[PDB]
């Protein structure tokens, strides 16, 4: 239920295709590249969670 | 159901319950669904199957 609350979620059978889009914050923020060193909110702009029903 | 804790009272002006299948048409079972509005008289007390349906 906390997956069909995020503003870009989808649902589909594993025998067809569909595009999960990324949603962009309303700011000018620029994220750093590279390995995740100390805190992740600088580097990662999202996290793709796929999960089975 | 978190945002309803900020108001005492409610009432569903409308509702509906979709069924989003997961199988092909090579599997079969009639299943029957409804919404009872006396939430105390329950079906669990029936002990046959022909009256439950």
């Amino acid at each position: 239920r906390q997956a069909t609350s995020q503003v870009g979620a989808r649902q589909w059978n594993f025998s067809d295709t569909t595009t999960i889009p990324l949603i962009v914050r309303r700011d000018d923020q620029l994220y750093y590249t590279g390995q995740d060193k100390e805190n992740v909110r600088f580097s990662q702009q999202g996290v793709f969670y796929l999960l089975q029903v | 159901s978190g945002l309803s804790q900020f108001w005492e009272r409610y009432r569903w002006h409308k509702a509906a319950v979709r069924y989003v299948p997961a199988v092909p048409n090579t599997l079969a079972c009639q299943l029957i669904g409804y919404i009872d509005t006396d939430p105390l008289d329950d079906p669990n007390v029936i002990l046959d199957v022909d009256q439950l349906l």
């Binding site: 069909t4 609350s5 025998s15 067809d16 | 979709r18 989003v20 092909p24």
Partner: peptide
């Protein structure tokens, strides 16, 4: 009245899956 719009909508779109296309 006093109603925020588009709180948590969902939209569904059906399709089909035939057994052969036979182009």
């Amino acid at each position: 009245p006093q109603t925020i719009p588009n709180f948590n909508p969902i939209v569904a779109k059906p399709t089909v899956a035939p057994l052969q296309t036979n182009i």
